[PDB]
């Protein structure tokens, strides 16, 4: 996160840190708890991940230093990547992790609501991007979970900013015209959380951008409202 501040413990209880153990253990991506065995994250996070056996999901984490060999985590039973996904820049950058065990909800770990079908017309004015990502293009994973408040940008304005790309309505953009605050490396897969009627909604999944927090380069996010039926197809399968 560029231009952000330290989060307070319990502030983003749906935020997870997804770690890989191959070749060595390190943070790989962010993610969001959406159900008691479900993490919603970005499909591009699994490039070269050949098995869910190398993955560890840690919930209830503020500081990466809380993670040691004796720290509990959730194993991943299954990685479900949208079958139309090719790359982050072409969209469908969404994936589900089915956990080996059930998340017990509490003040440190709980789900974020998915957006409503009727809420595709609501104007979100209170949106925040969170993660342990870089504070600049050449940096390192941060110890403390960071947060930054970012305004949503119309699809038309986002398309003007990304000449040569196709910004679809399955994407949603966020950023200040003068830059300064944005997601960066290590934040991808994490949430873009917006508060409406005193309820937080998972509006976006951190996906891609040209550089980090550059002037007139908003962050591009998976527009979660456009994937609610796909999420329900996968999580509510009979």
């Amino acid at each position: 996160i560029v231009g952000g501040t330290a989060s307070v413990r319990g502030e983003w209880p749906w935020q997870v840190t997804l770690h890989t153990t191959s070749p060595t253990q390190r943070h790989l991506c962010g993610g969001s708890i959406i159900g008691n065995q479900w993490i919603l994250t970005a499909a591009h996070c699994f490039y070269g991940v050949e098995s869910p056996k190398i993955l560890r999901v840690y919930s209830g984490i503020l500081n990466q230093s809380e993670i040691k060999e004796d720290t509990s985590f959730f194993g991943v039973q299954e990685i479900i990547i949208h079958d139309q996904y090719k790359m982050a820049e072409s969209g469908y950058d969404i994936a589900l992790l089915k956990l080996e065990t059930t998340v017990g909800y509490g003040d440190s770990q709980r789900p974020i609501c998915l957006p409503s079908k009727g809420d595709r017309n609501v104007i979100y004015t209170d949106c925040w991007v969170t993660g342990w990502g870089y504070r600049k293009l050449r940096d390192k994973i941060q110890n403390t979970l960071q947060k930054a408040k970012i305004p949503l940008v119309t699809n038309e304005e986002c398309q003007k900013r990304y000449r040569g790309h196709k910004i679809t309505h399955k994407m949603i953009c966020a950023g200040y015209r003068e830059g300064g605050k944005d997601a960066c490396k290590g934040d991808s897969g994490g949430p873009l959380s917006c508060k409406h009627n005193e309820v937080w909604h998972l509006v976006g999944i951190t996906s891609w951008g040209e550089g980090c927090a550059q002037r007139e380069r908003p962050g591009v996010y998976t527009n979660v409202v456009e994937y609610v039926d796909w999420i329900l197809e996968k999580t509510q399968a009979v």
Partner: peptide, 7 residues
Amino acid sequence: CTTKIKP
């Protein structure tokens, strides 16, 4: 939430 994910 209005959208529900089954436990």
